[PDB]
Every structure is written in C-alpha cells, then in structure tokens.
Amino acid sequence: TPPGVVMGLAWTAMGGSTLFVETSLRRPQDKDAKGDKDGSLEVTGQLGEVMKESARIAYTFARAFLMQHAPANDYLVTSHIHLHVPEGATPKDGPSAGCTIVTALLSLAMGRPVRQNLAMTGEVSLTGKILPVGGIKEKTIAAKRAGVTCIVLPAENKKDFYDLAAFITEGLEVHFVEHYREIFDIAFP
Amino acid sequence: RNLQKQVEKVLRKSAYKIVSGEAESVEVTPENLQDFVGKPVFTVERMYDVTPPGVVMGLAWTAMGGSTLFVETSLRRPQDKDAKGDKDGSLEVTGQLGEV
C-alpha cells in the first residue's frame, strides 16, 4: 500500500468486492510558486453523475480538513491531481466509497502510507458526519477473504454488523465512528 | 404503516411462545422487547446539534411526509492569499439541483 492508495469495500451487483482507489500528481507542483489557481481534480473510472457529486464534496472536505489541521502545508490547495475510482459499484451503492477518497487524498498530502490492510467505507458530508450505507452483508463477507483485519464502518449501521452469523465475524477487529476526525487518528497512528 | 407491521411481528413471535413456549402469559416490557424485535434500527433523532460555523436546520416537504434536511456550506481555499486583489468568490453548488 504505497502512498496515495486505499482499499475499499463496494457492493457489486453480484456479491461484494474490494476494489482499490488510487491517486496521483499530474503537473509539476511549482509551475507558479505564488500562483493562485485551484488544484483541480481530474477523476477517471467512467463515473456517473452522482459519483461526480460525491467526489467533489469529498474533495472539498479534504481541502478543508487539511487547512484546519496542518496550516503550513499547501500541497493540496494548488496541485493538479488525477484520481482513479474503479468502476463496478452498483449505482445505488455509489456514494458508499466516499470516505475512502477523503483519506486517499490526505495520504498523498502528508506522504504517510496508510496502516496495513485496513479497509473502510461510508458516506461523508461537508462537515464530516458519516452516514449509513446499505448492503453491509455482502461487503463484510467479501472483505473477509482479502486479508483485511481491521474494518471500520459508520456508527449508525453497527446493529447490522452485530446480527450476522458469529463465524463470519470471528477474526477481524471492528471499529465504529460517527465524526470523521476520529478515523484520521486510526489510519495514521 | 411500519408501526403496524412491527406490532404484528411482536404479537406473532409472542404467539409462538405459547404453542410450545414455557410462558402461558406474555407481557412485553421495555427491558424484554429485544427478544422479539432485536436491536434498535435508529438511535439519532436529528443528524446533530448544530456545528458552529455553517449549518441551519431546514424543514422541507418531501414526497412522503415532512423532513428536516440540513444545509451545509464551507470554505474552499484560504481566504486572504491576496487582500488587495479582485476576483469575486464563486459558489459551487451541489446536490443534483434542477435549474430552477
């Protein structure tokens, strides 16, 4: 898991899957050292419209959290960035990957690779209040066999993770959260 | 409607506890309810007590009932990179809005 990539669960139309999400720089970062021009995102992955929406809002939350947290850094305000979200998610499930993006970008903006084999999901809002997502069962059973050990899920869906047959849940540890600022203190200990 | 289906389910899983069950007199009480309905499907009432900068509760007349949607707005870039400059700050609206 080098810098700027994160694995993420997704409810494929047939069972679950664990497609990755990836990120990269696209132009030299100091072509205008004092230039006031936006670090435009350039998404790819054959997206639908709702994916464009969720990507934009997630981008804004990332760009906001970082200036709130580490003011001196400015890699993300001004640096063109390609982002790659693989296709395959069922369209109703398409917002579900949102949280992964918000950490993907941050990794690239700090250079720390994520902690090993720690898949995550859940929708994000402009202030970082995670929201429930459906189809948890296919997601858990699919992520079980990828070697993931420490899943993290929205706190508002936890009951569904404590109703699946016990043998599926044995092994992997689980976390639960509601405000995204907690997850940033898990992934990067 | 949903309250109807769930009350029906409570009575039904109660009835199963008579034909063979030890009890001959079911009496649901809030502590016992879990056994017949499982864990709660909701816990939050509103999505949260307002975040200090930038939100306000907004009622809206959705197709089924009312609802309490939250409007949320935030800054997108540092504010004062050039105090003397002149390039007015555009909005970028989201939410799949129609033109009107």
Query: Residue B43: its chain A contacts at CB < 8 A?
Result: 156
Instruction: Quote the DSSP letter at residue B77.
Output: S
Query: Distance, in angstroms, between B74 CA and closest chain A CA?
Result: 7
Of A138, A154, A65, the C-alpha closest to A105 is A65
Q: In angstroms, what CA-CA distances link B19 with A15, A125, B8, B10, B25?
A: 39, 50, 17, 15, 11
Q: In angstroms, what CA-CA distances link A159 with A96, A173, B40, B43?
A: 18, 15, 7, 10
Residue B39: which of A53, A63, A162 has the nearest Cβ? A162
Three-state SS at A145: coil
Query: Residue A57: its chain B contacts at CB < 8 A?
Result: 94
Backbone dihedral region for residue B94 (phi beyond 0: left; psi -120 to 50: alpha; all else: beta): beta
For B97, nearest residue in chain A (alpha carbons)? A53
Instruction: Quote the DSSP letter at residue A112.
Output: P
Q: From the candidates A129, A162, A177, which should be mutated to test the interface with B, based on the most B CB atoms within 10 A?
A: A129
Q: From the candidates A60, A157, A176, which should be mutated to test the interface with B, based on the most B CB atoms within 10 A?
A: A60
Resolution of this structure in Å: 3.8
Is B10:B28 a contact under the CB 8 Å cutoff?
yes
* A98-122 exposure pattern, b = at least 16 Cβ within 10 A, e = fewer: bbbbbbbbbbbbbeeebeeebbbbb
| Measured distance CA(B17)–CA(A19) in Å, rounded | 46
A-to-B residue pairs, Cβ atoms closer than 8 angstroms: 43
Query: Residue A64: its chain B contacts at CB < 8 A?
Result: 74-76
Tokens 């009350």 correspond to: B7
Encoded amino acid at A43, one letter: V
Q: Is A53 on the interface with B (CB under 8 A)?
A: yes
Query: Distance, in angstroms, between B26 CA and closest chain A CA?
Result: 25
> Does A96 participate in catalysis according to the annotation?
yes
Is A156:A131 a contact under the CB 8 Å cutoff?
yes
Sign of the C-alpha dihedral, residues A10, A12, A16, A19? Answer: negative
Of A84, A147, A148, the C-alpha closest to A121 is A148
Helices A49-69 and A98-110: crossing angle in degrees, nearest 10, is 40
Question: Bridge partners of A19?
Answer: none
Is B36:B14 a contact under the CB 8 Å cutoff?
yes
Per DSSP bridges, beta strands B55-60 and A81-84 are: unpaired
B94 by Cβ neighbours in 10 Å (0-12 / 13-18 / 19+) ranks as middle
Do A156 and B43 lie within an 8 Å CB cutoff?
A: yes
Q: Is B81 on the interface with A (CB under 8 A)?
A: yes
Is A87:A46 a contact under the CB 8 Å cutoff?
yes
Q: In angstroms, what CA-CA distances link A143 with A20, A47, A66, A89, B38?
A: 12, 23, 29, 14, 25
> Does A139 participate in catalysis according to the annotation?
yes
Three-state SS at B66: coil
| Measured distance CA(A148)–CA(A126) in Å, rounded | 28
Is A44:A84 a contact under the CB 8 Å cutoff?
yes
Question: Bridge partners of A123?
Answer: A131
Query: Distance, in angstroms, between A91 CA and closest chain B CA?
Result: 15
Query: Residue A163: its chain B contacts at CB < 8 A?
Result: 38-39
Residue A125: which of B41, B72, B77 has the nearest Cβ? B72
CA dihedral B79, B80, B86, B88 (to 10 degrees): 10
How far is the first Cα of chain A from the last one, in angstroms, to the nearest whole number? 16
Of A176, A163, A123, A166, the C-alpha closest to A9 is A123
Integer-rounded Cα Rg, in Å, for chain A is 16
